[PDB]
Symmetry: D2
Amino acid sequence: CPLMVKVLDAVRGSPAINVAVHVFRKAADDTWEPFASGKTSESGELHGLTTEEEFVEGIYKVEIDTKSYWKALGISPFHEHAEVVFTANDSGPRRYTIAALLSPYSYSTTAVVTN
Amino acid sequence: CPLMVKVLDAVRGSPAINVAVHVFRKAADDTWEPFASGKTSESGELHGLTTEEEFVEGIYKVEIDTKSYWKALGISPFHEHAEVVFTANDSGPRRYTIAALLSPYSYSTTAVVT
Amino acid sequence: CPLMVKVLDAVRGSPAINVAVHVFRKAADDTWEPFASGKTSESGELHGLTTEEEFVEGIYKVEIDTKSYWKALGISPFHEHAEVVFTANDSGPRRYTIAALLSPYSYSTTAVVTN
Amino acid sequence: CPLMVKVLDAVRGSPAINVAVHVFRKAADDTWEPFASGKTSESGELHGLTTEEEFVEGIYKVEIDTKSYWKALGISPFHEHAEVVFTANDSGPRRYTIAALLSPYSYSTTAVVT
Ligand SMILES: O=C(O)c1ccc(-c2ccc(OCCCCOc3ccc(Nc4ccccc4C(=O)O)cc3)cc2)cc1
């Protein structure tokens, strides 16, 4: 599938499990429209967000709910969430993986784009 | 100086200079209102964004214009911008430094609160 | 298998392919003894370094040959290599993944340890 | 001051204070010879390690004692230490800053050469 998210926890040295992810797509009126959502599995991966057909060209926001993750673990973090904003599929369909590493005061994201 | 932003370039091994940064505060109606802005200096740092008097508790967004930065170097980047969204909290320490490390397909951010 | 390495390239937004990895284990005389080696695949992953039986307790060094990687791409990087040094299997067998993100002047490593 | 080390703690959102750092230079016989050492300050930085006169071209190793740092906070970390190994090269810029970001199971390092 063309959009996947994988999250690691740098404190525990583990997949980040049960991380909620909401994806938005910029609409014609310039608002963020809800596009897809899900949560990471026991492997820290989130599969099945969308399909090739539905994942059209656009500007997408992948919101990773890092505060809700840290608060569900009873930890007080810094950030409200991690925001990944990117233009997708503007040269034809690609497959996008958003990889994230989380600590309470830091996060890091990288994109792996394949054709 | 309660808020400082520092931006580094992981490709060239340098400060990220002349990067535009826009800070917003979340208003009561959930909209982002402009709060402060600037360009990073030769050291990749942006000082003097706000004062202790103006910088009250609440949710702030720091938007870093990474796309223009990369395109000026002739590099096509992945992100439209980098975003850092956080709550400022008078409990605990007073000075927030937001540090960003940039690559064309990656951004990392950490907070140093002292 | 109990020791895996996965590497991403933050410049290209791709797996880091053909990255050489050498693993060492501290011997009784305190020298670094060669233990296993390999290179990342087209997926940026390196599987098959060792076995449960051979991967005994010890202090291991995973050397990721980042300079050779960047130089094979004709790019001049900063670091000679990335070094991951850790005690393994001291509470029983675990499975270790060393995840790395590379840029010419930076690198990042995280460990995912499962039981 | 051609070489500076700065260390940050991603768990607490603070400088990593009183972290021991040992710098070595590679000798002709491939052994690591002591070169300079220190503890990070209250700002998490370590200044005054060397001078331009002593810091000649060659391969250097910066070893950061992250394991003691974490254990003093009551945290069992993954790494025995962090290592940064690099060639110092008079071609191009003169001042090397080695920045490290620490978590118990992760370390990241970037170089800023100006
Ligand atoms: O004050 C100052 O001057 C100053 C200077 C520099 C600073 C830094 C230094 C280093 C970082 O490092 C950035 C974070 C590290 C990169 O993150 C990632 C590491 C590993 C992976 N890997 C994966 C994660 C999930 C799934 C799969 C992978 C994989 O296959 O590799 C992704 C991102 C950030 C800031 C801070 C302050």
